[PDB]
Amino acid sequence: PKLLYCSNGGHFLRILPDGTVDGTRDRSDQHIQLQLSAESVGEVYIKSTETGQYLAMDTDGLLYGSQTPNEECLFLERLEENHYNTYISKKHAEKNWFVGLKKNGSCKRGPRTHYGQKAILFLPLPV
C-alpha cells in the first residue's frame, strides 16, 4: 500500500482509470495508492489499489495502465545510492527504458529516459 514520489517535479505516480499514467501532487487523489508486488527478487508488478490496473510500458516506451497483467507489466527494481528507486521495463530491459515523469508531471517516454535524470528516481512511501 505505497505511494511512489518522483524526485523530479515532486509528483506521486498515478494511474488514471483510462490507462493514462502521469503525475499528481494531490495526496488525496485516489489513483496514487499503489501496490508493489514482487514476482522474483527485484522484479515487481506495480498495481493500483483503486482500479487494479497494472503499470506497463508499451513498444514506444509510453507508460499506460494495463487492465490485466502480462510481460509488459514487469519492472526491475533497483535501490539507488540515496533511498530512492529506479524501475526498468523488463520487456525492454536491453533498451534501458525507465519509468519516469517530466517536471510538469507528465509521462517521460522510455526512449527519452536515461540514468542520472531525476525523472527516474522514485521514493516508495507507505500510505
From Swiss-Prot:
Changing N8A: No effect on integrin-binding. Coiled coil: none annotated. GO terms for cellular component: cell cortex; cytoplasm; cytosol; extracellular matrix; extracellular region; extracellular space; nucleoplasm; nucleus. Monomer. Homodimer. Interacts with FGFR1, FGFR2, FGFR3 and FGFR4. Affinity between fibroblast growth factors (FGFs) and their receptors is increased by heparan sulfate glycosaminoglycans that function as coreceptors. Found in a complex with FGFBP1, FGF1 and FGF2. Interacts with FGFBP1. Part of a Cu(2+)-dependent multiprotein aggregate containing FGF1, S100A13 and SYT1. Interacts with SYT1. Interacts with S100A13. Interacts with LRRC59. Interacts with CSNKA, CSNKB and FIBP. While binding with LRRC59, CSNKA and FIBP seem mutually exclusive, CSNKB and FIBP may cooperatively interact with FGF1. One of its GO terms (biological process) is branch elongation involved in ureteric bud branching. Predominantly expressed in kidney and brain. Detected at much lower levels in heart and skeletal muscle. The chain holds residues 26 to 152 of 155 of the full protein. Changing R109E: Reduced integrin-binding. Defective in integrin-, heparin- and FGFR1-binding, and defective in inducing FGF1 signaling, cell proliferation and cell migration. It comes from Homo sapiens (Human). In the nucleus, phosphorylated by PKC/PRKCD. Keywords: Acetylation, Angiogenesis, Cytoplasm, Developmental protein, Differentiation, Growth factor, Heparin-binding, Mitogen, Nucleus, Phosphoprotein, Secreted. Residues 102-118 are annotated as: Heparin-binding. Belongs to the heparin-binding growth factors family. Changing R25E: Dominant-negative mutant. Defective in integrin-binding and in ternary complex formation with integrin and FGFR1. No effect on heparin- and FGFR1-binding. Defective in inducing FGF1 signaling, cell proliferation and cell migration. This is Fibroblast growth factor 1. One of its GO terms (molecular function) is heparin binding. It is found in: Secreted; Cytoplasm; Cytoplasm, Cell cortex; Cytoplasm, Cytosol. Plays an important role in the regulation of cell survival, cell division, angiogenesis, cell differentiation and cell migration. Functions as a potent mitogen in vitro. Acts as a ligand for FGFR1 and integrins. Binds to FGFR1 in the presence of heparin leading to FGFR1 dimerization and activation via sequential autophosphorylation on tyrosine residues which act as docking sites for interacting proteins, leading to the activation of several signaling cascades. Binds to integrin ITGAV:ITGB3. Heparin binds at N8.
